[PDB]
Amino acid sequence: YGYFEETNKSEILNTSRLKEMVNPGDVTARELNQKQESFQMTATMVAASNYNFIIDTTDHGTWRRLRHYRSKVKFCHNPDPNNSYEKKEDPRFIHEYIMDPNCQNAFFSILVYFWEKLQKEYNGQIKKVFCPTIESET
Amino acid sequence: LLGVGNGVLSIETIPAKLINHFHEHPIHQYTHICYEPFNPENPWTKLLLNALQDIIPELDARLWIMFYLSTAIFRGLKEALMLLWLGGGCNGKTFLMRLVAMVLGDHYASKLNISLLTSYRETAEKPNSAFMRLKGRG
DNA sequence: TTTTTTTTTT
Ligand SMILES: Nc1ncnc2c1ncn2[C@@H]1O[C@H](COP(=O)(O)OP(=O)(O)NP(=O)(O)O)[C@@H](O)[C@H]1O
Numbered sequence: 001y002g003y004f005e006e007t008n009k010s011e012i013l014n015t016s017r018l019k020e021m022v023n024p025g026d027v028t029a030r031e032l033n034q035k036q037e038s039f040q041m042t043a044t045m046v047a048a049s050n051y052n053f054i055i056d057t058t059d060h061g062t063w064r065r066l067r068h069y070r071s072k073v074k075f076c077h078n079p080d081p082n083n084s085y086e087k088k089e090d091p092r093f094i095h096e097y098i099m100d101p102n103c104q105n106a107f108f109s110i111l112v113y114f115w116e117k118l119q120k121e122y123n124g125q126i127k128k129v130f131c132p133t134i135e136s137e138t
Numbered sequence: 139l140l141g142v143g144n145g146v147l148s149i150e151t152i153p154a155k156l157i158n159h160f161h162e163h164p165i166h167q168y169t170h171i172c173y174e175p176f177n178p179e180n181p182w183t184k185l186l187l188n189a190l191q192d193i194i195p196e197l198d199a200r201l202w203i204m205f206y207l208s209t210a211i212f213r214g215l216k217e218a219l220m221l222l223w224l225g226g227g228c229n230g231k232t233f234l235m236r237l238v239a240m241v242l243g244d245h246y247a248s249k250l251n252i253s254l255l256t257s258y259r260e261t262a263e264k265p266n267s268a269f270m271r272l273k274g275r276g
Numbered sequence: 277t278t279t280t281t282t283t284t285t286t
Pocket residue numbers: 061188189190192193225226227228229230231232233234
């Protein structure tokens with residue numbers, strides 16, 4: 001698993017690196033004071049930002065790999081009762097409920113259960129999951 | 139002379155011979171693949187031949203591609219040729235290309251960085267381990 | 277150890 005954050009305003013997505021980091025194949029890199037070596041690429045990627053990436057290519061090899069989702073709800077102080085997509089925030093979620101071992105292992109159990117559910121429902125193929133919202137937004 | 143998983147393969151004369159006995163050839167590098175004589179009735183051989191037919195429709199193009207890729211077995215001087223393969227995406231390009239490197243092993247085959255081919259040469263003298271990967275590989 | 281690499285510069 002690998003995730004990205006801290007994106008600047010209107011950054012350009014380097015599609016050459018995209019084809020190289022999400023691909024069931026080998027990749028080649030180098031560490032400090034070390035020789036070249038190659039390893040399999042096996043990381044799940046998530047990118048979070050407040051601005052849409054700039055994608056300057058239209059080839060099927062690029063857009064078959066991308067999925068886009070937009071957040072609807074907002075967490076703040078004094079949420080407007082007229083907005084269903086606005087909620088009261090609880091600081092503990094990031095200040096405490098991310099460091100407590102109990103919630104961490106509960107979340108790990110949830111992840112294991114969902115992995116088992118994916119294996120037993122779609123034979124492990126994420127592409128077979130039905131989701132109109134993600135498809136429409138992408 | 140090509141080192142394989144179950145001995146060493148000699149392709150000096152046709153048909154190729156497998157050396158399962160004592161020999162004095164100074165051979166160190168090897169691939170983990172166990173060599174077996176070609177057999178079209180092997181289910182895996184049938185599957186691979188059908189996949190090759192599916193990927194490359196034209197017969198003459200398929201024969202030329204198989205002839206060019208077969209020269210990877212030999213580690214000596216060969217014709218000054220390079221193959222450029224263009225595709226819209228999700229069309230089996232990386233499957234065959236990576237399968238060739240998988241069956242040749244790391245000592246005889248390697249993925250190469252694209253910057254090694256589309257970027258200016260380093261200034262004067264600097265160490266270049268990416269170019270060093272080219273030594274001894276077919 | 278000790279150096280080269282890296283760093284730094286292009
Ligand atoms: N003979 C075949 N029959 C059916 N599916 C195949 C065959 N060969 C490859 N595939 C599948 O086709 C998909 C594309 O293969 P892949 O080699 O990764 O694509 P590519 O042409 O290199 N594309 P890209 O790198 O995305 O531009 C993969 O899911 C393969 O498993």
